[PDB]
Amino acid sequence: DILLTQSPVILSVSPGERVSFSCRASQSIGTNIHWYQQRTNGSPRLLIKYASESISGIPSRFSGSGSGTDFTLSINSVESEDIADYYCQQNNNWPTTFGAGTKLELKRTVAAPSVFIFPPSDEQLKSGTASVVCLLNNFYPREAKVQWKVDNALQSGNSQESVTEQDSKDSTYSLSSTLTLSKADYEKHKVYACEVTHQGLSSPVTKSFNRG
Amino acid sequence: QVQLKQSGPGLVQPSQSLSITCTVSGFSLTNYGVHWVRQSPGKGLEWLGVIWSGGNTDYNTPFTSRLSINKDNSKSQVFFKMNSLQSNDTAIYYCARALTYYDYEFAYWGQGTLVTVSAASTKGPSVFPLAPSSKSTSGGTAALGCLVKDYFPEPVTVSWNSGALTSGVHTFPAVLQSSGLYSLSSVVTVPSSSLGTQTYICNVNHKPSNTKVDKRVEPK
Amino acid sequence: QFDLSTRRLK
Ligand SMILES: *[C@@H]1O[C@H](CO)[C@@H](O)[C@H](O)[C@H]1NC(C)=O
């Protein structure tokens, strides 16, 4: 099979900038290469066919060039909606094969998270489990720190985090930190605090509540 | 308009077989071939095979023995079937159509079907409210959400107000709990002044267990 | 590596 090598693995650029993706082939494949875009939760979208031929419905800022073994997909002026993964495909040789992709991230100005805390619902408590949710909304960059404390006791190992992919409109991330306690443990304590640390904050933000 | 719509996501027990139906429209299976591609964590995009206009099939070499593709032209359905699945066959499977009848440049894709190969049992989620409050309201903007907890396998869909509410929505990637069950929150920020006059509902759909829940989320 | 949850490389 033809091996397709995409480089680098991650690209990071600022909006309006030009960016190029590299796709290299294990042996010559002429111009028999196609390019695809994959956005979060999407199926691939065909961007360019046969190295340089344009596709109907695709923005003019997308183009491709190359021949033989060395190929390039370009975006002359990147937009927030371009945040996605990009894949090349060869069909000069059977079976058709795909590269492993390149991730395109967008830089933007620093944005401090908005922090919100949510106690467990009385509904969930009926089931014997308590989830405390802490939400960091619309921040950049992705690096953040969440510290949980129950009655001044540092919590460790009993929380999971999830981070969205970059917003296609404003380029921010959001993060949820969920602290999970048995209902029994939850009832044996009073003060629940979520403490947030981010480059955009001039001091840590603490959101908290007393049970009841 | 050319469209490909695949059957829903689901569990398949190890060593068992996978079945997906691809129903197309805006073209005839008598005029175009239909291709199958998958996307897995370990191998990424793999082309699996194709059924051609006239009924001939090609299968990528590693799959010749356990893959069968069939269609019903009149029904516009293409039928994908793969045998003896192992855990690394866990992938999103797509059906696809090229630009020209003989080619492989895939201009049209189905929405994908997430197939999980696992010994475990299908389980629907419980949906709990993340109620807005003062601890959740700053500068007239309130945050609220739904905790979608303890389901298996992926995925679940979550929308808000039956699709009418999309701005400010973040549905977080699921995380696997130690129980082997997935959990997820979905949030949305809204004007705090609208908490009195607007209803907020997360529409949760877990197709593999056929669990559909509408959860109203009210200030506490 | 492709993530099945988000369909993005992680
Ligand atoms: C999964 O395992 C088989 C052997 O059982 C291996 O040959 C194959 O390459 C693997 N496939 C993936 C998608 O990782």
Residue numbers in the entry:
A (entry chain A): 1 to 212
B (entry chain B): 1 to 220
C (entry chain E): 2 to 11
From the paper:
Recently, a unique binding site for a cyclic 12-residue peptide was discovered within a cavity formed by the light and heavy chains of the cetuximab Fab domain. Here, multiple crystal structures of meditope peptides incorporating different cyclization strategies bound to the central cavity of the cetuximab Fab domain are presented.
Other cyclization methods, including the formation of a lactam, reduced the affinity but not to the extent of the linear peptide. Of note, although there is a significant error in the estimation of peptide concentration for AHA-, β-Ala-β-Ala- and Gly-Gly-linked meditopes, the off-rate is independent of the peptide concentration. As expected, the affinity decreased with increasing distance between the linker and the Fab (Cys-Cys > MPT-Cys > AHA ≃ β-Ala-β-Ala > Gly-Gly > linear peptide), underscoring the importance of van der Waals interactions in this region.
